[PDB]
Amino acid sequence: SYRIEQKRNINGAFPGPKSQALAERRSAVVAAGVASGVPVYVEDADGGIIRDVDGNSFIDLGSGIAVTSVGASDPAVVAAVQEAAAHFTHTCFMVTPYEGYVAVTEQLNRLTPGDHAKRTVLFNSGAEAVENAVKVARLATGRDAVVAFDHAYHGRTNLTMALTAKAMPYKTNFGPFAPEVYRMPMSYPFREENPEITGAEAAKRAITMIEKQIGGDQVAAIIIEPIQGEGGFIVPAEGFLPALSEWAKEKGIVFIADEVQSGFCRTGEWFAVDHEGVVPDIITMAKGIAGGLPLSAITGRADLLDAVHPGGLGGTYGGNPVACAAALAAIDTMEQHDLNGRARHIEELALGKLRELAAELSVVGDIRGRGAMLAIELVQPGSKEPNAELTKAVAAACLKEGVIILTCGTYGNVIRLLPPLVISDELLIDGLEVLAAAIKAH
Amino acid sequence: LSYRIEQKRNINGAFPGPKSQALAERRSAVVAAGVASGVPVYVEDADGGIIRDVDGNSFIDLGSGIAVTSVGASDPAVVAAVQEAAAHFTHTCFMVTPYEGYVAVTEQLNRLTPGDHAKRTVLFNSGAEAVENAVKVARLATGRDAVVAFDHAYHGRTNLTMALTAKAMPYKTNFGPFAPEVYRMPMSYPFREENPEITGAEAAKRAITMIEKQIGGDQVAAIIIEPIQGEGGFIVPAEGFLPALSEWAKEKGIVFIADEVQSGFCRTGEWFAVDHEGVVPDIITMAKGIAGGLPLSAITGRADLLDAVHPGGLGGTYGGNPVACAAALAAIDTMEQHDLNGRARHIEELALGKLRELAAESVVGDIRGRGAMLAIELVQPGSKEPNAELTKAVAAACLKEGVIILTCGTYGNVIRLLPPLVISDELLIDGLEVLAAAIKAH
Amino acid sequence: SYRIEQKRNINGAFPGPKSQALAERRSAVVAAGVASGVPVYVEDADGGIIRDVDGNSFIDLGSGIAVTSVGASDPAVVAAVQEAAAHFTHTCFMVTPYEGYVAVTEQLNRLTPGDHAKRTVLFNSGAEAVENAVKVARLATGRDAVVAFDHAYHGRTNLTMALTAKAMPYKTNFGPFAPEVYRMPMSYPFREENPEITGAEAAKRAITMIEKQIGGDQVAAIIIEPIQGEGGFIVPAEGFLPALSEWAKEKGIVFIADEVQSGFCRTGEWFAVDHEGVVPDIITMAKGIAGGLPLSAITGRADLLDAVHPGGLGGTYGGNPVACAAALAAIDTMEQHDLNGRARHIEELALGKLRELASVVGDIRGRGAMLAIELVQPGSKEPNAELTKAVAAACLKEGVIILTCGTYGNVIRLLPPLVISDELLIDGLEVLAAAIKAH
Amino acid sequence: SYRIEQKRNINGAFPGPKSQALAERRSAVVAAGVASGVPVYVEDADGGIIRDVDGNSFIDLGSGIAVTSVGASDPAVVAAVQEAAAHFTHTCFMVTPYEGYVAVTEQLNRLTPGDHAKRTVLFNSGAEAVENAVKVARLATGRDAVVAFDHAYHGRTNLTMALTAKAMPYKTNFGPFAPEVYRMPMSYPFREENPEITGAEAAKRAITMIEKQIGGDQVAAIIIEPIQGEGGFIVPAEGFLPALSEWAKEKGIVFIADEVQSGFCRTGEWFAVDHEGVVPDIITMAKGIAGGLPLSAITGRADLLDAVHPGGLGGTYGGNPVACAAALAAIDTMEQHDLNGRARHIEELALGKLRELAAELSVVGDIRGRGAMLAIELVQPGSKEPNAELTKAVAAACLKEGVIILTCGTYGNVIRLLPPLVISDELLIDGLEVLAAAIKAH
Ligand SMILES: *Cc1c(COP(=O)(O)O)cnc(C)c1O
Ligand SMILES: *Cc1c(COP(=O)(O)O)cnc(C)c1O
Numbered sequence A, D: 001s002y003r004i005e006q007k008r009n010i011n012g013a014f015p016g017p018k019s020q021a022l023a024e025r026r027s028a029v030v031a032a033g034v035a036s037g038v039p040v041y042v043e044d045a046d047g048g049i050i051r052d053v054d055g056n057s058f059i060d061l062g063s064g065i066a067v068t069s070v071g072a073s074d075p076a077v078v079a080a081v082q083e084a085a086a087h088f089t090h091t092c093f094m095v096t097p098y099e100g101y102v103a104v105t106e107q108l109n110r111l112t113p114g115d116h117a118k119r120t121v122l123f124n125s126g127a128e129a130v131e132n133a134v135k136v137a138r139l140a141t142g143r144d145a146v147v148a149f150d151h152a153y154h155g156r157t158n159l160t161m162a163l164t165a166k167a168m169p170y171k172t173n174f175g176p177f178a179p180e181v182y183r184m185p186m187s188y189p190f191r192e193e194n195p196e197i198t199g200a201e202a203a204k205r206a207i208t209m210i211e212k213q214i215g216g217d218q219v220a221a222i223i224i225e226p227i228q229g230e231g232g233f234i235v236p237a238e239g240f241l242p243a244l245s246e247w248a249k250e251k252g253i254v255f256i257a258d259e260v261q262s263g264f265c266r267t268g269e270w271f272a273v274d275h276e277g278v279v280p281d282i283i284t285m286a287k288g289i290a291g292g293l294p295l296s297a298i299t300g301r302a303d304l305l306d307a308v309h310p311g312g313l314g315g316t317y318g319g320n321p322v323a324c325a326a327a328l329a330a331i332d333t334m335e336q337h338d339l340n341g342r343a344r345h346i347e348e349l350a351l352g353k354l355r356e357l358a359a360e361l362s363v364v365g366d367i368r369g370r371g372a373m374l375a376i377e378l379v380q381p382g383s384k385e386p387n388a389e390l391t392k393a394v395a396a397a398c399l400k401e402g403v404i405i406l407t408c409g410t411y412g413n414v415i416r417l418l419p420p421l422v423i424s425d426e427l428l429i430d431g432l433e434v435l436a437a438a439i440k441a442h
Numbered sequence B: 001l002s003y004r005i006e007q008k009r010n011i012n013g014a015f016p017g018p019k020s021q022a023l024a025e026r027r028s029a030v031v032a033a034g035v036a037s038g039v040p041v042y043v044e045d046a047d048g049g050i051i052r053d054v055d056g057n058s059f060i061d062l063g064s065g066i067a068v069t070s071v072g073a074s075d076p077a078v079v080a081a082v083q084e085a086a087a088h089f090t091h092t093c094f095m096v097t098p099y100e101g102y103v104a105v106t107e108q109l110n111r112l113t114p115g116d117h118a119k120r121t122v123l124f125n126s127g128a129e130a131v132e133n134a135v136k137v138a139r140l141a142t143g144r145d146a147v148v149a150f151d152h153a154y155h156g157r158t159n160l161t162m163a164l165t166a167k168a169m170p171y172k173t174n175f176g177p178f179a180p181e182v183y184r185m186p187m188s189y190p191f192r193e194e195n196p197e198i199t200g201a202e203a204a205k206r207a208i209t210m211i212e213k214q215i216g217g218d219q220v221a222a223i224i225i226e227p228i229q230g231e232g233g234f235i236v237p238a239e240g241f242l243p244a245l246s247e248w249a250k251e252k253g254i255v256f257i258a259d260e261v262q263s264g265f266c267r268t269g270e271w272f273a274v275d276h277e278g279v280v281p282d283i284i285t286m287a288k289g290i291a292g293g294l295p296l297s298a299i300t301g302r303a304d305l306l307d308a309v310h311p312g313g314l315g316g317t318y319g320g321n322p323v324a325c326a327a328a329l330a331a332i333d334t335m336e337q338h339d340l341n342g343r344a345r346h347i348e349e350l351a352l353g354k355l356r357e358l359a360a361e362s363v364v365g366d367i368r369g370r371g372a373m374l375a376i377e378l379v380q381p382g383s384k385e386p387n388a389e390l391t392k393a394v395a396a397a398c399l400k401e402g403v404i405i406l407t408c409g410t411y412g413n414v415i416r417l418l419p420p421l422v423i424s425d426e427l428l429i430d431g432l433e434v435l436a437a438a439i440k441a442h
Numbered sequence C: 001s002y003r004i005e006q007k008r009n010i011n012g013a014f015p016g017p018k019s020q021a022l023a024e025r026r027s028a029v030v031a032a033g034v035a036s037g038v039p040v041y042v043e044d045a046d047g048g049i050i051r052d053v054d055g056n057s058f059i060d061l062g063s064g065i066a067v068t069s070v071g072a073s074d075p076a077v078v079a080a081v082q083e084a085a086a087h088f089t090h091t092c093f094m095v096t097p098y099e100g101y102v103a104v105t106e107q108l109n110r111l112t113p114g115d116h117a118k119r120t121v122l123f124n125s126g127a128e129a130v131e132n133a134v135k136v137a138r139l140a141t142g143r144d145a146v147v148a149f150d151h152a153y154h155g156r157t158n159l160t161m162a163l164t165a166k167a168m169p170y171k172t173n174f175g176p177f178a179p180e181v182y183r184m185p186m187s188y189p190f191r192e193e194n195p196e197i198t199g200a201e202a203a204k205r206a207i208t209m210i211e212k213q214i215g216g217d218q219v220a221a222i223i224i225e226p227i228q229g230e231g232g233f234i235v236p237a238e239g240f241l242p243a244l245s246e247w248a249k250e251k252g253i254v255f256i257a258d259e260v261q262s263g264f265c266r267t268g269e270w271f272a273v274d275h276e277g278v279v280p281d282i283i284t285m286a287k288g289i290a291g292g293l294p295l296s297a298i299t300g301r302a303d304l305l306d307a308v309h310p311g312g313l314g315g316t317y318g319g320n321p322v323a324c325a326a327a328l329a330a331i332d333t334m335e336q337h338d339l340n341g342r343a344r345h346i347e348e349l350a351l352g353k354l355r356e357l358a359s360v361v362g363d364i365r366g367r368g369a370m371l372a373i374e375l376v377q378p379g380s381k382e383p384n385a386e387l388t389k390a391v392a393a394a395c396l397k398e399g400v401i402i403l404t405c406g407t408y409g410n411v412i413r414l415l416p417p418l419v420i421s422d423e424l425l426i427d428g429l430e431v432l433a434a435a436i437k438a439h
């Protein structure tokens, strides 16, 4: 059940007058480099719809980059936020604590993988979460080196930029970057030089390289996204992640799962790592956790997190009570409405339609992902060469028909589906039809 | 002025009470042990100058969540704005689908920050993100690497902001290695200058020569300084220091960054601490008080600098969250409607009056600050040696009587007053009386 | 014509009494970690022979890690050093200059690739050369990033460690390392995941990765050894080095050829890059340059090197006059006796015998007097470090000092002095062949 | 007893024809930035004379920046080099070892301070020596941070540049620099803001700062020159350090004495540290060690150096046998001719003449140093402001009269005397007379 009409409706040209008026105001005061993928301005966002200030209704297939999984205005989230703000907006947990922080903390302990003792700390952004996961690995192990992977993305702070692989736009001219970060090869099936390579073998390749170029006993942490987001929704070959996990344990290296984008039901399991039963030492969370409010978290082994000295990890706003209220409600919605199930259903529907399209066409190089985190990598006809032009064009074409869809990828040639999990089959199918028509059209 | 909950200090028997204890017991199973709180009671409602715990005790709030809830922890306007905004949409990510709130907050910061030159703004979540982004801009726009920070600086808990931060315990220990090309220079700290007669101008010349000799003016991307150093101990530089640095920075093409995360938005009796001396920073970093307790941060600076950054270079998922933006617009509005600059100046007159009365009856080394950002540095009797023991003891003694007061300082020996600006004279005086009694008692 | 008898001769067991006496002294005073590959102590070294203090004569197939290419006591070098030391040992070129520095500088300008305007600065070690090449690239381009490759080795200072790939023993526990160094995939034919990959294709793989992970316009320098030394005498596929060079020029990136080990006739050309006609923007030199004396150099484009401010590049000892005298003589010997030719001849002989030896032999590669055999496990490509250690020991036992190397510790390398006789080289190769068969 | 006539003798204008011919050759082939302080080219250098290719004889008051302490062609050194080179030039100690290395190693063990177990490794340059000291400290302690001081100079590699304080010309545009280097205040009596400050107090200032900004238990090494060379022959106040040494021992910090310039009799003791009886954990050596040949060394505690793994420390050329021969002879000369005594005698003579000059004048700010490492810091008349113009001019004036004298200093205003220790009283006095005349003249 939804608040605004759940269907695609574009009345004439856009941006309309009220959107244009905002754009004109914007350019006087927001940095020129801060661009938006969409030229219309939101007034209301709900279910699978973004409704602009000129009354146009777009299908939302991005969920704010995997954030509003429960929907951009889930009643429970809205109510919780409204109620919490009336009591106190902020007291800073490090100064005067409050139940909401503890309570979110309890849920994450429960929902994250593994049955060992775990603890949590809360912050605001994904980047802060990753920063803190690395702080903990480094202090707990007494080591320096952190290994990250090709096609990784972990944020826009200096260290998270360091950890991030792609330079444009995330890194160019922003260095020099945090030291002792090393990059290793990813398991990226569609582009392996030897297509027959196994997950285990891909892991062994990474492991040998780490051992030879750093040494296992010198690495504080291995950080990897179980499904690489901005890198192009790269899913590693079966057996890769477990091999890295096993080896990390052998060598006393903290294995950090970055589930900022893949976490909270997005992939059809609570965490992406659940697909293969990998149990990370620390896991970083944000985006979907708090139904749109700014919250992030690390949850990991008690012995690691409890190693940090008093006052070592923190922040002013972190674990904001209004955001915490949002999170508790968001997680509750995830359970009450079985969003894991909705995500699995979305996979079945969307991959169905996409494979139909593959069978008609060829520009469709690879279809991959899980749950509500799906992607199609577009290539040049009859080869594997990347096709960024087609990708840019298809996104624009979709936008023209009233479908907001996101792109990504190291080579700028991956269309990604990140719909809110509460999206109706009707709307999703409509969106997928527009997408399929766009690809055919170009 | 008028409030929601009774504005009186009221402690019913021993605390933490039962409901607080229950929360502490829950907390220790799930929150990392290093995340400590200064206060053992759990908030239920925070309003005006009072923190009311879950067991019905009412403490005087002389910390405002570390300078965050300047307008109060539940300002009706803020609360209303948050409630209203959340009902429309919690998040769409400005970089994907933009929205008025972002632009509007951006318009206000342009207007309220110093200088009449062309300015632009980008929004993020935390103070650390803000400082990170200022440095990104300075580095890209100047084409240089080096950033100078000062003794007693504090700028955050990410890797770079830790690098910029001076004090190692607890902010840095075992969390490195730290981001490169950060250089540290001597601060103007009157009370501890080896030559007590030194002038602000002379202190600036000392810093400038050192920068020139050890980096070179044309090699420095940015000088970053807090006009009043917060965690460092509410250090106010001698008159003439900040302008000298500013003038020189302009000479050498160096971006002068004012970190006003803690001192900004009326805290000091002016909109920004730099306004006391009429310094006009090239970029200024903001958070804490900006959004009445919601998680928001900002950089506002010269258009030519910020606009230099390439499309997509600066950003974040949550940044400039719409619910937070609503909160900021309301918070800023309250600051104007109720003349919080005036309230801050009044707080100064009152608080410095009572503190100087106490000095006049020695363990009180220095009284300093301005507006609602005031401090007393405690020393050993009859010398200038730091007295952390007395500082810890006074904070504890205050808490016991129902007054939550914060401490700070490089040497752990500074009591700081950061009351909310909406505090009543009655409550402030009560708090100051408790403070004065506590110092005398120990 | 040689000074000491050019015959392999081991009298009984070693280390002998005088060597043992030195080892006993050594352990009281030299750091324990500083180990030597050979347990005997040199008294005289000449031609292809190392003669120890107990009168044993070993065949020298390492030339001090590619240093004594002209021989460990070339008469010309010896005479020049003796003469120069009598006038002055040192005045520091940055204070009071002298002809020797300028002269060495003239020769390097002449002998290095390319006809464009070039300039030179001198230092002491290979690591100092590389450090200075990077300083110049960074200042001239105004950029930060430097790319190095898998299997690279460039030295033991903090930055050169950073540039170096292998952690044991060069890096472990010695960091944190100099920032803004990025590592890219090498063209290593024998271990390519796709054995059919081309040099051009391997270069494209590296280039795309650089572009995507740094950006061409952000890179101050690409640094590569034309033949990777300590990494295992890895020779890249034809077309790789020129592609990188072309691209570097396109993007304003300084292309640094690290020829510290491969330079000065070692590969049968003056510089390894000459095999493919690549013309580096800066080239780093040491080892062979001064016939054993401590000297190093960078030689590169005038417009790059001249960009550095007065006093920016230097050092106290750098371009030492005694070492310069040695270099001029060494280079002279290289020409007078056509050591390039001797090197090409050593290749023909050595590669001949090594190919006859062919299973435990994975790959035979190299050029001139810089040759190698990579040993694997029988019937696979898995590395065989055990066999490699054992063969080196077996050769030592028979009076042949031979060096090993490689990322996986499984490469036997031939680095004989270029003045070695065919008789001695064949003898050494026979001992090597016998040792491999033996294990 | 000497080889060439020990008298100052300039025949007409210079550079003469043969020098000019070399300059013309030079400019075609040496980088333009590589400048020389002296426009004439050496043919022979012996005793206290540099004789150029046009037959002019200059007094040498620089000894090649403190290198040719035994003289630029000491017969013993010359003979030893000649003999050694005939046997073998190089075999690489790590491959085939040799007596010369071991022997030099024995002497350094014997001559360095302390009676504890010591070990040595050899390299080529001073920078390599410092690099290796730091490698050992870092591995042996398991820590990262290295503290260096204001006015320090340690070399021109990336890390030694990092350690070095002054940017022009050593650092400008050559970064980014090696991470985890921290800079602390030096004891520099002449420029202390509080002139009455004590060495012990100065050390306490540095120590507190280290403790507060890094933490004692986080520092791998403290590296300091007992007399700072290029920084301006700064001698710390008595008691400085010993206090640093005592504290380093308490905190498990490796204390590195950089004696590359001050070592081997230069100050009138074998090492500058011997003046105050400080016993460093590692000591770095080069310059004077091998009478002009390229050699350097670290000598330190067995337990520290032996901690390094096999193959960890090394180099190709390091401990070159011809250089080793030189060193043994050079050390032998130092003993046979009591160069410590000669240095002490030089001090008495030179400081005598310099203080006479101070009495006549005022432009002479400070006279300091020990042994044959002496300096006069020149200031503006009647103040402490630096006088780089006078300094440049005096050096030029001296050169004109046939005296080659070096300058140095953070502020470019220090004339330094680094004569070879084998210089005759007659020549030294002549040189000092020219110097005194030059200062008076300008
Ligand atoms: C979005 C993202 C981040 C950074 O999160 P922010 O909240 O934008 O700081 C980090 N890691 C991954 C894997 C992400 O997808
Ligand atoms: C609190 C503080 C910061 C960091 O802000 P967070 O939001 O706590 O990351 C930065 N700068 C100053 C001056 C501060 O007081």
Ligand SMILES: *Cc1c(COP(=O)(O)O)cnc(C)c1O
Pocket (backbone or CB within 6 Å): C124, C125, C126, C127, C128, C130, C153, C154, C155, C156, C225, C229, C230, C258, C259, C260, C261, C286, C287, D315, D316, D317
């Ligand atoms: C040996 C080596 C160096 C280091 O030279 P040193 O003089 O030992 O510092 C640098 N680069 C390469 C390619 C080498 O083989």
Ligand SMILES: *Cc1c(COP(=O)(O)O)cnc(C)c1O
Pocket (backbone or CB within 6 Å): C315, C316, C317, D124, D125, D126, D127, D128, D130, D153, D154, D155, D156, D225, D229, D230, D258, D259, D260, D261, D262, D286, D287
């Ligand atoms: C000259 C100097 C060095 C550097 O030695 P080089 O051989 O020139 O690398 C190091 N330390 C000190 C104290 C010096 O004066």
